[model samples]
Target chain A: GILEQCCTSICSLYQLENYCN
Target chain B: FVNQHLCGSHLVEALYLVCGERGFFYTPKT
Candidate 1:
């Protein structure tokens, strides 16, 4: 869950792929 | 995210390409 949130946040912060589901 | 289980290697690699393997992402807690 930590990593997923990190990815989601990173994606939002960096504006990258929408890996969040 | 560095959770190899939650995030795939490809996605992780993609993030690495941009994030430069950040300590938090690379060495995540288990």
Candidate 2:
């Protein structure tokens, strides 16, 4: 828990792509 | 390189595995 970032959700590729830029 | 600037790519990868598709999120060190 002390080595990961925070994220909302991974529902769509667009979401991932949009965030993981 | 900017890619190694700790992009969201690596962030997501570690986040998903370490925390999983749910709670548990924080930084290293106290």
Candidate 3:
């Protein structure tokens, strides 16, 4: 579930700010 | 996730995304 955790973390971060923004 | 998610337990990373309209979801990883 490492990938899942990683993805979840990314998604959570994405929710806060866009990579391009 | 990005170059940090790949390094020798230190540097690399991985970037993940699930994009679509609201109320919709995408399952890319299992």
Candidate 4:
């Protein structure tokens, strides 16, 4: 899902490893 | 050490929650 993917990518940008849906 | 960066983490957390609430529930795969 692009929504989750976007969230995941943003999470990565914040250095939040494995912190997305 | 507890400052803006830490607050940013909170922001991100909230953002994540909002994203989850939009249409899907989130669970860690690992």
* Top candidate (DockQ): 1
Q: Which stretches of candidate 4 lie over 4 Å from their true place?
A: A1-21, B21-30
Candidate 3 C-alpha lDDT tens digits along B1-30: 574345323201222222222222223345
- Tell how far residue A20 is off in model 4, in angstroms: 13
Say which prediction, candidate 1 or candidate 2, comes out ahead on TM-score: 1
Total backbone collisions for each predicted model: 0, 0, 13, 0
Task: State the lDDT of candidate 2 residue by residue for B1-30, as single tens digits.
Answer: 554235455655654654544544434332
- Quality of candidate 4 docking, DockQ: 0.13
What does candidate 3's lDDT look like per residue over A1-21, in tens digits? 334544445435454223212
lDDT of 1 by residue, B1-30 (tens): 445565645456665565543422444443
lDDT of 1 at B26: 44
**Candidate 1 residues A1-21, lDDT tens each?**
435556444444254343322
Error of 4 at B3 (Å): 1.3
lDDT-superior candidate, 2 or 4: 4
Model 1, first chain, TM-score of 0.21
lDDT tens per residue, model 4, B1-30: 655445455545665655464533334232
Model 2, docking class: incorrect
lDDT of 1: 0.47
